[PDB]
């Protein structure tokens, strides 16, 4: 199918810094894939990014009253919607499920790859550390980055490539805002 | 920055399909299901603590379709430029034999927001327990989508996520099976 498609995309964004201590509101009118019209709570009025929005901007900017009301959103819309459900978003907390296994077992005579697989934890923010005999493995570490599962949970994989010695005790340390004390799992020889 | 809540909506002509949904820091909170005319929550729990009148959304969607047509003309009918997906197939949690799990077909960076997705267990389509998410917004005004296929890691089975988007010449298959 090749018949042309035309897309309209409207985005109303509420950006919060320090809880609700500093809120920002934006309205992005988008055509196909370019933003043409945009209201910034920090500017007060509408701005036309591309000539496509020109008319709109100048027509709304003349209504000083309405143009005012939109500034209010930071309260009527943003700060309001914030509390309407911080109970199940800002304060969501799902504990990480950590597991440490190494790719290829047989290979404990030469180069190997240890894998720390953190799964299903919520607050995106997390931090993993690889300890070779209680000693930060500051390098030679490869991470998957943060991965969004799309179901309000994340997963991530941090792997350690090392030459396994029958004594060395490598530990994976996971720090995440859902546990009082750090999460650690060990693996050696 | 700390958080961002986005009321995101879109209308697509000629397909005459739109979408209204709230996004909190990347994940979907809820979205109005046009047809059923009712609002849908990503997590049951969310609903039990808040509400939204589906109708009011169906109202915007319509004024969007309008503004769209005006915005079409105003630009001498220049169509959207297809941007092909980028599919990856990961497993929800570490896959271990005979232990329940889920396959996630994660389609990213595309537009127009239109794409057919099929799960195939050993080249045959599967239509059960499968689940998808609506079209989630990106900062670059593209889309992201998710598909779910809960399975039972078997040594003898092989899965394929077939994705067909207009920006793709022929369908696309991401392959998965136990033991990389």
């Amino acid at each position: 199918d090749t018949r042309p498609r035309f897309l309209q995309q409207d985005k109303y964004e509420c950006h919060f810094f320090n809880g609700t201590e500093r809120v920002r509101f934006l309205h992005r009118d988008i055509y196909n894939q370019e933003e043409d019209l945009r209201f910034d709570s920090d500017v007060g009025e509408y701005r036309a990014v591309t000539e496509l929005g020109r008319p709109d901007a100048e027509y709304w900017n003349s209504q000083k009253d309405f143009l005012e009301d939109r500034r209010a959103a930071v309260d009527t819309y943003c700060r309001h919607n914030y509390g309407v459900g911080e109970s199940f978003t800002v304060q969501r907390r799902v504990e990480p499920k950590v597991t440490v296994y190494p790719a290829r077992t047989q290979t404990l005579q030469h180069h190997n790859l240890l894998v720390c697989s953190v799964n299903g934890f919520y607050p995106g923010s997390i931090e993993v550390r690889w300890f070779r005999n209680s000693q930060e493995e500051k390098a030679g570490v490869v991470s998957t980055g943060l991965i969004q599962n799309g179901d309000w949970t994340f997963q991530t994989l941090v792997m350690l490539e090392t030459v396994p010695r029958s004594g060395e005790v490598y530990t994976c340390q996971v720090e995440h805002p859902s546990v009082t004390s750090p999460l650690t799992v060990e693996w050696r020889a | 920055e700390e958080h961002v809540i986005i009321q995101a909506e879109f209308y697509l002509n000629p397909d005459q399909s739109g979408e209204f949904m709230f996004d909190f820091d990347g994940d979907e909170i809820f979205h109005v299901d046009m047809a059923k005319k009712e609002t849908v929550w990503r997590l049951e729990e969310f609903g039990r603590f808040a509400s939204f009148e589906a109708q009011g959304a169906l109202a915007n969607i319509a004024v969007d379709k309008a503004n769209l047509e005006i915005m079409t003309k105003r630009s001498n009918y220049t169509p959207i430029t297809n941007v092909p997906p980028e599919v990856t197939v990961l497993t929800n949690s570490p896959v271990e034999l005979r232990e329940p799990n889920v396959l996630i077909c994660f389609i990213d960076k595309f537009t127009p927001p239109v794409v057919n997705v099929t799960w195939l267990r050993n080249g045959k389509p599967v239509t059960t327990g499968v689940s998808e998410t609506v079209f989630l917004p990106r900062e670059d005004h593209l889309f992201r989508k998710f598909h779910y296929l809960p399975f039972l890691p078997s040594t003898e089975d092989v899965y394929d996520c077939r994705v067909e988007h207009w920006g793709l010449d022929e369908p696309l298959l991401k392959h998965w099976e136990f033991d990389a």
Partner: peptide, 14 residues
Amino acid sequence: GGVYHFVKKHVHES
């Protein structure tokens, strides 16, 4: 909890 507010879309043909 409570109720969600959504900004409304307004169009202007010129």
